[PDB]
Amino acid sequence: NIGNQLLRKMGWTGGGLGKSGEGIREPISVKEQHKREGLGL
Amino acid sequence: PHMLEQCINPFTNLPHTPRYYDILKKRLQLPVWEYKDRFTDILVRHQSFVLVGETGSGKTTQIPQWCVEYMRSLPGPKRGVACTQPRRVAAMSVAQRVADEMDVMLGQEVGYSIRFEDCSSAKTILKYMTDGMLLREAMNDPLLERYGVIILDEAHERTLATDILMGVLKEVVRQRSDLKVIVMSATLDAGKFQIYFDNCPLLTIPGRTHPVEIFYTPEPERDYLEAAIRTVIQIHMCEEEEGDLLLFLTGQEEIDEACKRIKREVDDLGPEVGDIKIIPLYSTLPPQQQQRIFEPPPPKQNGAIGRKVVVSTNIAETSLTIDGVVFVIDPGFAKQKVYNPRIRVESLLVTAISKASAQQRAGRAGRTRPGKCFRLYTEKAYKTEMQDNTYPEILRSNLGSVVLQLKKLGIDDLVHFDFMDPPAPETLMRALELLNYLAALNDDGDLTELGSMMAEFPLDPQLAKMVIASCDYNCSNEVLSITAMLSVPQCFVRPTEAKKAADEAKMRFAHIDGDHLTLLNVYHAFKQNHESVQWCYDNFINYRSLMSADNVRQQLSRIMDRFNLPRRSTDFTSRDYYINIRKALVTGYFMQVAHLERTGHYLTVKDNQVVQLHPSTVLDHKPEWVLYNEFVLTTKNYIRTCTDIKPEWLVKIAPQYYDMSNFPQCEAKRQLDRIIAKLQS
Ligand SMILES: Nc1ncnc2c1ncn2[C@@H]1O[C@H](COP(=O)(O)OP(=O)(O)O)[C@@H](O)[C@H]1O
Numbered sequence: 001n002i003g004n005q006l007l008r009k010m011g012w013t014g015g016g017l018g019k020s021g022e023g024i025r026e027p028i029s030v031k032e033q034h035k036r037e038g039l040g041l
Numbered sequence: 042p043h044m045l046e047q048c049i050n051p052f053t054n055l056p057h058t059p060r061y062y063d064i065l066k067k068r069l070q071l072p073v074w075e076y077k078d079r080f081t082d083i084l085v086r087h088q089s090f091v092l093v094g095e096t097g098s099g100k101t102t103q104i105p106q107w108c109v110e111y112m113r114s115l116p117g118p119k120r121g122v123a124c125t126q127p128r129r130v131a132a133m134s135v136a137q138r139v140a141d142e143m144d145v146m147l148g149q150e151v152g153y154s155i156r157f158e159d160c161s162s163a164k165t166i167l168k169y170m171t172d173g174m175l176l177r178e179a180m181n182d183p184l185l186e187r188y189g190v191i192i193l194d195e196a197h198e199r200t201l202a203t204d205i206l207m208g209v210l211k212e213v214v215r216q217r218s219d220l221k222v223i224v225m226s227a228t229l230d231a232g233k234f235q236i237y238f239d240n241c242p243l244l245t246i247p248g249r250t251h252p253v254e255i256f257y258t259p260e261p262e263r264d265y266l267e268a269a270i271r272t273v274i275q276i277h278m279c280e281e282e283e284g285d286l287l288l289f290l291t292g293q294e295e296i297d298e299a300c301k302r303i304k305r306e307v308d309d310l311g312p313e314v315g316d317i318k319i320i321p322l323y324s325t326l327p328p329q330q331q332q333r334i335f336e337p338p339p340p341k342q343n344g345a346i347g348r349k350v351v352v353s354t355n356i357a358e359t360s361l362t363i364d365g366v367v368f369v370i371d372p373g374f375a376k377q378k379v380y381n382p383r384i385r386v387e388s389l390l391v392t393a394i395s396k397a398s399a400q401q402r403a404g405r406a407g408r409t410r411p412g413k414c415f416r417l418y419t420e421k422a423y424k425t426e427m428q429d430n431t432y433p434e435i436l437r438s439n440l441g442s443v444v445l446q447l448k449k450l451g452i453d454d455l456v457h458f459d460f461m462d463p464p465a466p467e468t469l470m471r472a473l474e475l476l477n478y479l480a481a482l483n484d485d486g487d488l489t490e491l492g493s494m495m496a497e498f499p500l501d502p503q504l505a506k507m508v509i510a511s512c513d514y515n516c517s518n519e520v521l522s523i524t525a526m527l528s529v530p531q532c533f534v535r536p537t538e539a540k541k542a543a544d545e546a547k548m549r550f551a552h553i554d555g556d557h558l559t560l561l562n563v564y565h566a567f568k569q570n571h572e573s574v575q576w577c578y579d580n581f582i583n584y585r586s587l588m589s590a591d592n593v594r595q596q597l598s599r600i601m602d603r604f605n606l607p608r609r610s611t612d613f614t615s616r617d618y619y620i621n622i623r624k625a626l627v628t629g630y631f632m633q634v635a636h637l638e639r640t641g642h643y644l645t646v647k648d649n650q651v652v653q654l655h656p657s658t659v660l661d662h663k664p665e666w667v668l669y670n671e672f673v674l675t676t677k678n679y680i681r682t683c684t685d686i687k688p689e690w691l692v693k694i695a696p697q698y699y700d701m702s703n704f705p706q707c708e709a710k711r712q713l714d715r716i717i718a719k720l721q722s
C-alpha cells in the first residue's frame with residue numbers, strides 16, 4: 001500500500017483528484033484491437 | 042506599439058530575398074491574416090487567451106511570427122517566443138517552414154527543440170519545441186524567463202505534457218505579469234480552455250472546409266490494411282478529378298508494409314496507369330524524409346492522372362496540412378500507449394478512434410477542394426462503436442515520469458494540482474509507488490537527491506535509475522549504449538520476403554544471455570565498422586536507428602558529465618563484464634521480471650501475467666528468470682527484449698519490491714524464500 005500512503009500523505013482523502021475533487025474515480029479501460037479486423041467486426 | 046519597419050531583413054539589415062516575398066504573397070491569404078489586428082488588440086490587453094481555428098487556418102506558422110513582432114516592440118533585453126507541438130514532425134517541419142517565411146537560417150533566429158535534437162542557438166528568438174521539451178526547460182527555469190510569449194498549440198490533442206503545461210503555466214502567470222500565454226486548438230471543446238484560464242478571451246477563425254462526401258462499407262472489414270490498399274488503388278483508377286490521397290495507418294512498420302504493397306499492386310500495370318508518388322509519414326523520419334510530403338505530385342502521356350499518396354499516422358489528422366489532398370482513407374484506428382494501473386502493465390495498443398477524430402480525418406479531405414472520405418467501416422459502427430471523444434491522455438497513461446517532473450518542479454501536492462482532467466487516484470498511487478521503489482521519492486513522498494538527478498534525464502524513470510546506478514557496477518559505458526539502443530526504433534530489419542536471411546543476420550549479434558546484450562553487440566559492431574551504411578545492409582541492421590542511437594548516447598553522456606557521473610567499463614576478459622551489466626539492468630527493471638513455470642510459460646512477478654518470450658527474442662532457451670523491457674499485448678501476452686537474470690540479484694538489489702511479507706504465493710516466491718533462508722542460515 002506504499003502508493004496509497006504517499007497519496008494520503010499528500011492530503012488525499014478519497015474520491016477523485018483535482019483541485020475540487022471532480023476527477024474520475026476509476027481508471028478507464030481501453031479495448032484493444034487484435035490483428036487487423038475492421039471496426040465493428 | 043509602432044516600430045520603424047524599413048523593407049529590410051531586421052535580423053540582417055539587408056534586403057529580403059525574392060523567395061521571402063513570394064512566400065509572403067501566399068501567407069497573406071491564410072484565414073488567420075484577416076484577424077491580425079483583432080489578435081494584436083487582444084494580445085496587448087490580456088495575459089492569456091485562446092485561439093481556435095480549423096487545421097489549415099495558419100495558426101502554427103503565422104501566430105508565433107506575430108508574437109515575435111510583438112516582442113520586438115518591448116523595451117529591455119530581448120526574450121523569445123516558444124510554441125509547443127505535441128508532435129516531433131510538426132515541430133521540426135514547421136520550424137523549417139517558418140525560418141523560410143522569416144528569411145532566416147533554421148537554428149539561428151528560428152529553431153526547434155526535440156528530446157535529443159536541439160536546433161537552436163543564442164540568436165534563437167522563436168523556437169518550436171515539443172510540449173515535453175518545454176516542461177523539461179521549466180525544471181531549470183521555473184518561470185520560463187527565456188520567453189515573453191508561450192504558445193501551447195494543438196491543445197485539443199490533450200497530451201499528457203500539454204495538460205501538465207497548462208497547470209504549470211496557470212501558476213507561472215500568477216507569479217510573472219510580463220508573460221503572455223496563448224492556447225491554440227482546432228476545436229472549441231465547449232470553451233474548456235477559456236474557462237480553465239479564468240474565462241479569458243477567445244478568438245475564433247471561421248473555417249473554410251469544402252464539402253466532403255463520406256462513404257461507409259456495407260459490412261465490417263475482416264482486414265483493415267487490405268481494405269486500405271484496395272481503396273487506394275480504386276480511388277487512383279476510378280476518380281476522374283485530379284487530387285492526392287491521404288491514408289491514415291497506425292505506425293511505422295504498418296505504414297512501410299502498406300507502401301510496399303501499394304507500389305507492387307500499382308506497378309503491376311505497366312502502361313497507362315497514372316504515376317503515383319508514395320510517401321510515408323511517421324514520427325521518427327529524418328527532416329529530409331518529412332519534407333517529401335510537400336513536394337508536388339507526378340505529371341499526367343495518355344492522360345493518366347498523376348497523384349501523391351501520403352501513407353501517414355494521425356500526425357496528419359490535425360498537426361499539418363498537405364495542400365492538394367482530396368481523398369482520405371480512414372481505417373478508423375490509431376496506436377496508443379496504454380497503462381493499466383491494476384496490473385502495472387503499459388503496452389502499445391491499436392484502438393478505434395473517436396467520432397471526433399474521424400471527423401477531423403474527413404475534414405482533411407476538404408481543405409483544398411470538395412473531397413471524399415472513405416471510412417472502412419459501417420455507419421452503425423460509426424454510431425454505436427465509436428465514442429464521441431478521445432479520452433485525454435492523462436486518463437490512460439503511466440504518470441511515473443510526469444509525477445517525477447512535477448516533484449522536480451517543486452509541485453508537492455499532486456492531489457490538488459489543477460489538472461484539467463484529473464487522473465484516477467489509483468494511477469497516481471502507482472506512480473508514487475514506482476518512484477518510491479526506485480528511491481526517487483522517500484517514504485514521505487519527497488524528492489530525494491537521486492530522484493532530482495533522475496529527473497534531469499529525458500528517460501523513463503526506470504532507465505534513468507539504471508543509467509545512474511550502473512556507475513556503481515563499473516559498467517555505465519555499456520548501460521549507456523544499451524539505454525541509447527532502447528531509446529530508438531527497432532534496429533533489426535526483417536523483410537516479409539526474407540525472414541530467414543534477416544533472422545540469420547540477427548543471430549550474428551546474439552548474446553547467450555539475451556536481448557539487452559545483443560543490442561550492445563549491435564551498437565559496438567556499428568561503431569567498430571565506422572557507421573557504415575554498407576555494413577548495415579550486409580547485416581540487416583537499421584542504419585537510421587543506429588545513427589539515432591549514437592546521437593542519443595552522445596547527448597546522454599553530456600548529462601553524465603554535467604552530474605559528474607563516471608563513464609566506466611570493466612575488464613572485458615573477466616566474467617564480471619557481462620554479469621555487471623546484467624546486474625545493472627536489475628537496478629531499473631526489477632519490476633519487469635518473469636519466472637519460468639513448470640509447464641513452460643512465464644509468469645510476471647507479483648502481477649502474475651501469463652506471458653511468453655516474444656518470438657523476435659534471440660534466446661535459444663528459456664531462462665528460469667528473465668528481465669524484460671516491453672510488455673506486448675496482442676492475442677497473446679509477450680514480453681520483449683529479454684535477459685537472463687539470477688534471482689539472488691532481485692533480493693539483493695531491490696528487496697523493497699522483493700518483500701516476502703507481501704509477495705503472492707507462486708513458484709517464484711518459493712525460490713526466493715529458499716534463497717532468503719539460505720542467506721540467513
Ligand atoms: N512546411 C510547409 N511547406 C509548404 N507550405 C506549408 C508548410 N507548412 C505550412 N504550409 C502552408 O501553410 C498553410 C497553413 O499552415 P499552418 O500554420 O500549419 O496552419 P494550422 O496550424 O492552423 O493548421 C498550409 O496549408 C500550407 O499552405
Ligand SMILES: [Mg+2]
Pocket residue numbers: 100101102194359360361
Ligand atoms: Mg498547426
